[PDB]
Ligand binder design. Structure first.
Ligand SMILES: Nc1ncnc2c1ncn2[C@@H]1O[C@H](COP(=O)(O)OP(=O)(O)O)[C@@H](O)[C@H]1O
Ligand SMILES: Nc1ncnc2c1ncn2[C@@H]1O[C@H](COP(=O)(O)OP(=O)(O)O)[C@@H](O)[C@H]1O
Ligand SMILES: Nc1ncnc2c1ncn2[C@@H]1O[C@H](COP(=O)(O)OP(=O)(O)O)[C@@H](O)[C@H]1O
Ligand SMILES: Nc1ncnc2c1ncn2[C@@H]1O[C@H](COP(=O)(O)OP(=O)(O)O)[C@@H](O)[C@H]1O
Ligand code: BEF
Ligand code: BEF
Ligand code: BEF
Ligand code: BEF
Ligand SMILES: [Mg+2]
Ligand SMILES: [Mg+2]
Ligand SMILES: [Mg+2]
Ligand SMILES: [Mg+2]
Lengths: 561, 209, 486
């Protein structure tokens, strides 16, 4: 394993390779420049990026000595044996040759010496600080360390002389993911029509070993697909199956649709099965939401050509049972961005600060595998007004909404975070969240009219057998203040009456397929016990809020310049 | 803040120790309505943790002599919930009010937000500054971003039209600038950020202080 | 114990058996395709599903070397001994042969490295993370893990190379329960008249490990029946009765009626004794409730042929002393689904978010062992509309209402969750929860008329001796404004 295997992190690879190779191949340049080269480097980043692979390539490339020190491998049961093991390892690395020391998983070695309560860990940290910087510290040897969290390292160990250069091996770009895909698909015969560029542009949050997991899952699905024409063959698989196997693009598409990034494995949502034509009506809202999501994740070049950051948030509000959660499911099921779903009061806890810690962890996992899209359903449970309750739990919901306001706009880079709010009452929302920059798209989802109720009834009756003479125009024209939940209730009552008639015909046939589709009598009997969901006062309240938002749009006209 | 005992004050302690070590520095305490919460003593609380946080911040902010010259900056949305014990003269006395922008400030905001943008030469922002009176910089940025989104949509439509007419030539971009029609279409759904009662509350607080 | 013992999870069984068996029988496919197979199994799910049985069958049939590691078995009192024990275990598994390592209950040696406070746990986590994937990590060995909760695991341990393919051995289906019944009743002399199809169809929310408890309870009931009539002969049992013992069908019916799923053992309803014939009158309401309950249970084929989801919710409102709680009890006695009942303020607590956690846990337990029906009693108590108080009590009733609206219709699978609500105050109910999808059927149970009054007078006097000249028509006609409680 050489240096042609950890591609996608070329800048950090060159930054490490310089301070390893240039004071080791030709040190006359550093002897002529006057001073000493740096002799310390600390790798930090997310797990599964390539730090251990880079250290293995460093150990395999150079012909110098290499000593491997693991994290808890230096500890021993004897009182005073871990310091002796560290001293013997350093003396073996210094005495033989100018060598490279690798300290893997340093978080079990440095507990920061201010939070631990033991003695052996502080003795080990003090021995490391003595051997790394002091009298007879280092004689032409370098130390490399790798970790998953950089904040659990001692500030005296994060100093110059011991660990001065901190390389940041983060998530790769699209070209980095394409380079990792080209590296991991160079020892296998794939196809004549495989597209690694579209595969790299299709994934969005994969980092490091997740591309190898994708390739291994695609190859395993190909092996399990090309074993049904032949038998099990417990003795020997003949030479006809070994040649011309082929890994086509459908295996890669199945492995991409059947996997997830390694950081978002905890917040995986259940795969609901909807489409864009399943959400009947709301054509302009659907098109605007779809383009607002798909524009900065497909064409960033125009966005940096115009020199402006794209829009991030969108909030749906209106009558209940209209299609807000259905629009969120349609976004979750087929849009290329990763989906983190979260309920309203789900992230709360009885301890002091655990709710804000869960909010920070959710937002950090959202911005880690960017681009992600977040669905904050029912914002009126955790994000309320501030100072409205006299008796509370010591001001905890205020800290929750302050953490939400800070994480949505603060000292952040704001790479790609798309928050979605779906609240059926926009009065209890804080006025600092509806400010643009956090949630600027306040989309009002109104009640469907006669042209939208027909499309809703056509979308809800998509996968059912229907009468060829049955029309939905009379159902769309009779109901005028109804909703999609009411039309679904009408369809479910008609299906229940059809199932009752079918089981009655089955019982009569067993006493002495009768109902192939839903007839008109089932709809005529189902439309007798059907009522509207929303009343007239709540519709007036929603129109009053919409007219207040339009009165906030005052002094607007054709706007001649 | 932490759920353990002592860590919720030790975090403020070693953050202020890192501030006192690297002198000079600036400690920007953002959203002080969660750290410097009003007490409201009525014999019922969660145990007295926010009181310990406020007391630790007070005894770590009172030991600031002429040496080590640190500076604490705060910025809140609701100024009514800030502790008068931390708003005391001698601990934190300065109070700069940042009002809503006027006509010239709105024109300066519209000129500073459009710095690195390929703007039209025959385009003025004085009509946008005059037609909007109670707007703010956030919704002005929203207006500019919607105009850029409309220009990007027009560029995508022109690019797919060019691809269709090539499969069945313009310049390097068919829309090299943001036209006036993009701004006129982006200002169609241009709401305002702040309401009227919040301005009354902020004016009442500015008249009280 | 073999591979024909864990039937019921075919996809998870194949997904484990593929990477267990294929790189050991013939590796020519992997040598031709060039790539290396995955070497990590994480079996998560509900407790009592078959992960330990799968590991035992893998240990019993696969001829490679095996090494089982318990959760808190490597932990020792010496400083630096648990990591040495893990290193010695891995070097022993790597030294002999290409082997399989089964680390059971990994929730005790992996506390996520952030919520823990010790040092030995972090060093054990670092030892596992270094020894599982690092420099010269694993020479042709595969690790299998089993856990009851997958969320309290380190995301660095949930990575590719260490634990990559996470199989989901979950709650089985009708054919899976039939396979478990046919597996567990193949060694006993059962009967000549016992069918397993009705037993697999009437069993609804069993986790797969309660089927063996059902058969053991039926066998113990048959043995206890045979021990009381014929004398026990405590010196030595007579061998004539041992040749003809059997297991009859009423023993299985009594064992089904005297058991419960292992997940719903904490919210068990007390044994009330009512009957559909004990609720007089309300024939249309009774047949509509029976339709709404037993159409998606008995006929799933018509619902999956029409391609539509069934209606689940129903609300009962009307005057008190009418039979709403009696209809809920008549549901709780003899429907073909499990029952989970609550009171009004019963799921509320004094801490912050504990009522939300109770709501989420009881709805996850209702939707896990599906089909269940939930009797949300006093929807006026558990659900206000929104923000009705001038001074709030901390902002908790609105959060309870929001969690109810999210759990009844949100981003879930919605397998089978029937919500029965009985209230006597419909003015203080949320219109967002009166909306279809959560509670569509607004059944109004009115005061009885003359015929319903006669039927409830005949039903309340069902088991009593009476005079033969007694005429209830004058009692039914003279009151004309009364109710069932009166
Ligand atoms: N950046 C990367 N480029 C190429 N392969 C990678 C990369 N990161 C991980 N891999 C793959 O994953 C394997 C294990 O990665 P490793 O270095 O042990 O993980 P980590 O990033 O946690 O230190 C490598 O041998 C390689 O096959
Ligand atoms: N526009 C619609 N088109 C199709 N089905 C709809 C529509 N609106 C509602 N429905 C149906 O009614 C249900 C209620 O809609 P939903 O989005 O959950 O409501 P809400 O806006 O309260 O969150 C949907 O899940 C779907 O089954
Ligand atoms: N799917 C299943 N098929 C067969 N037996 C099962 C199944 N699930 C559980 N069992 C039985 O349940 C009992 C306990 O299950 P076991 O594997 O020990 O527990 P667990 O599933 O918690 O790891 C055993 O007798 C086992 O055979
Ligand atoms: N419609 C009825 N039919 C039969 N018995 C009834 C009826 N209504 C009331 N009863 C009797 O009176 C009791 C009170 O009814 P119950 O359901 O407990 O109260 P509620 O109507 O307040 O929900 C029942 O348990 C039963 O004994
Ligand atoms: F960063 Be890896 F998990 F070693
Ligand atoms: F019921 Be919906 F989510 F308003
Ligand atoms: F081991 Be089992 F999942 F309880
Ligand atoms: F009092 Be009953 F439950 F209506
Ligand atoms: Mg590593
Ligand atoms: Mg919803
Ligand atoms: Mg087990
Ligand atoms: Mg009752």
């Amino acid at each position: 394993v050489g240096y042609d295997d950890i591609g996608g992190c070329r800048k950090q690879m060159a930054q490490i390779r310089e301070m390893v190779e240039l004071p080791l191949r030709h040190p006359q340049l550093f002897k002529a420049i006057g001073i000493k080269p740096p002799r310390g480097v600390l790798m930090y980043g997310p797990p599964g990026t390539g730090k251990t692979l880079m250290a293995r390539a460093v150990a395999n490339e150079t012909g110098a000595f290499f000593f491997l020190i693991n994290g808890p491998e230096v500890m021993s049961k004897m009182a005073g044996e871990s310091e002796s093991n560290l001293r013997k390892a350093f003396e073996e690395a210094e005495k033989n040759a100018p060598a490279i020391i690798f300290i893997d998983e340093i978080d079990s070695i440095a507990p920061k010496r201010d939070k631990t309560n033991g003695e052996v860990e502080r003795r080990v940290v003090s021995q490391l600080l003595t051997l790394m910087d002091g009298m007879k510290a280092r004689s032409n040897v370098v130390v490399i360390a790798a970790t998953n969290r950089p904040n659990s390292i001692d500030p005296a160990l994060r100093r110059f002389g011991r660990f001065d250069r901190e390389v940041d091996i983060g998530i790769p770009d699209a070209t980095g993911r394409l380079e990792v895909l080209r590296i991991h698909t160079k020892n296998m015969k794939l196809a004549d029509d495989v597209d690694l560029e579209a595969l790299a542009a299709e994934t969005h949050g994969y980092v490091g070993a997740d591309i190898a997991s994708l390739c291994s899952e695609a190859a395993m699905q190909q092996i399990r697909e090309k074993m049904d024409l032949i038998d099990l063959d417990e003795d020997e698989i003949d030479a006809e199956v070994l040649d011309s196997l082929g890994v086509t693009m459908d295996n890669f598409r199945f492995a991409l649709g059947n996997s997830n990034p390694s950081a978002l494995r905890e917040t995986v949502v259940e795969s609901v099965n909807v489409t864009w034509d399943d959400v009947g009506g709301l054509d302009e809202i659907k098109e605007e939401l779809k383009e607002t999501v798909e524009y900065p994740v497909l064409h960033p070049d125009q966005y940096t050509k115009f020199g402006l950051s794209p829009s991030k948030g969108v909030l749906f509000y209106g009558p209940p049972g209209t299609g807000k959660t259905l629009l969120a499911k349609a976004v979750a099921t087929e849009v290329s961005a990763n989906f983190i779903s979260v309920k309203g009061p789900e992230l709360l806890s009885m301890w002091y600060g655990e709710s804000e810690s869960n909010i920070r962890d959710i937002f950090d996992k959202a911005r880690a595998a960017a681009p992600t899209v977040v669905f904050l359903d029912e914002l009126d449970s955790i994000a309320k007004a501030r100072g409205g309750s006299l008796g509370d739990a010591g001001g905890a919901s205020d800290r929750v909404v302050n953490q939400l306001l800070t994480e949505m706009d603060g000292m952040n880079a704001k790479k790609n975070v798309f928050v979605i709010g779906a609240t059926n009452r926009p009065d209890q929302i804080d006025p600092a969240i509806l400010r643009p920059g956090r949630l600027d798209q306040l989309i009002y989802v109104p009640l469907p009219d006669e042209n939208a109720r027909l499309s809703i009834l056509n979308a809800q009756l998509r996968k059912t057998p229907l009468e060829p003479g049955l029309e939905l125009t009379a159902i769309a024209k009779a109901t005028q203040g109804f909703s999609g939940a009411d039309l679904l209730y009408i369809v479910q009552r008609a299906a229940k009456y059809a199932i009752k008639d079918s089981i009655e015909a089955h019982r009569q046939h067993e006493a002495e397929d009768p109902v192939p589709y839903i007839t008109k009598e089932h709809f005529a009997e189902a439309m007798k016990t059907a009522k509207r969901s929303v009343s007239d006062a709540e519709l007036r309240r929603y129109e009053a809020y919409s007219q207040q938002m339009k009165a906030s749009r005052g002094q607007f006209s054709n706007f001649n310049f | 803040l932490s759920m353990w005992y002592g860590e919720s004050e030790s975090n403020i302690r070693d953050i202020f120790d890192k501030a006192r070590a690297a002198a000079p520095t600036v400690v920007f305490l953002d959203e002080l309505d969660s750290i410097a919460k009003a007490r409201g003593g009525s014999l019922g609380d969660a145990g007295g943790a926010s009181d310990r946080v406020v007391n630790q911040l007070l005894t770590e902010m009172d030991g600031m002599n002429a040496k080590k010259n640190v500076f604490v900056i705060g910025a809140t949305n609701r100024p009514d919930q800030i502790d008068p014990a931390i708003l005391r003269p001698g601990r934190l006395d300065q109070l700069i009010y940042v009002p809503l922008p006027d006509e010239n400030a709105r024109l300066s905001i519209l000129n500073a937000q459009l710095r690195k943008t390929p703007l039209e030469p025959g385009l003025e922002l004085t009509a946008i500054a005059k037609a909007t009176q109670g707007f703010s910089g956030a919704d002005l940025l929203y207006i500019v971003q919607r105009a850029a989104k409309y220009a990007i949509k027009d560029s995508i439509e022109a690019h797919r039209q060019h691809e269709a007419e090539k499969e069945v030539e313009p310049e390097v971009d068919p829309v090299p600038y943001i036209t006036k029609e993009h701004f006129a279409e982006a200002m169609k759904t241009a709401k305002r950020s702040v309401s009227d009662a919040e301005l009354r509350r902020y004016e009442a607080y500015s008249q009280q202080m």
